[PDB]
Structures are given as structure tokens and as C-alpha cells.
């Protein structure tokens, strides 16, 4: 009820944390409009 990531019998997200830019408020959490999501290697 508090967050779209909350709930479950394990502390886990359960959905891709990368979210589109034109998402409604209350859903647009996590990594907003992300082009890539990893450890920065190189440039």
C-alpha cells in the first residue's frame, strides 16, 4: 500500500526497477528512464 516495491515473504523487488519516463506518479520509483543499469566499466 506504501510503495510499489513493498510486500512479499522475502524482501525483494519482484519487478524491473528500470521504469519508463512517462510513468504516473506513485509508480515512477527506482531507476527512472535508465539507458543502462550496471557497474561503470570504461566510459
Amino acid at each position: 500500500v506504501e510503495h510499489p516495491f513493498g510486500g512479499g515473504n522475502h524482501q525483494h523487488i519482484g519487478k524491473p526497477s528500470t521504469i519508463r519516463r512517462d510513468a504516473p506518479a506513485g509508480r515512477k520509483v527506482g531507476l527512472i528512464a535508465a539507458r543502462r543499469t550496471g557497474r561503470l566499466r570504461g566510459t
Binding site: 500500500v1 506504501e2 510503495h3 510499489p4 506518479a25 506513485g26 520509483v29
Partner: protein, 51 residues
């Protein structure tokens, strides 16, 4: 569901800035004839800490 924490920040009244002990808006001098065609001279009085 309930309105989330990141949504609640835009309404204000709890998440507003703590600006009680701040010294003022830090900005440049306004542009005029002196600063547009020549130069003006001022003096540094003191250096203060802004919270």
C-alpha cells in the same frame, strides 16, 4: 493504495527547506551602466558560513 513518500514531498509543509538561519539568496550584482560599460569597485567585508 496510500500516497507514496516521493509523492508527498511536492505538497510541502514538512519537506520544505530549513531557511530560518540562512543569510540570504547568494547572487551576483545586478547589471547596470557601470558593470555594462566599465567596472565598479567593492570591498569584501567578511566571509560567513551559510547553513
Amino acid at each position: 493504495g496510500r500516497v507514496i513518500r516521493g509523492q508527498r514531498k511536492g505538497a510541502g509543509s514538512v519537506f520544505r527547506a530549513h531557511v530560518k538561519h540562512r543569510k540570504g539568496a547568494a547572487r551576483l550584482r545586478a547589471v547596470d551602466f557601470a558593470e555594462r560599460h566599465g567596472y565598479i569597485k567593492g570591498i569584501v567585508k567578511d566571509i560567513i558560513h551559510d547553513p
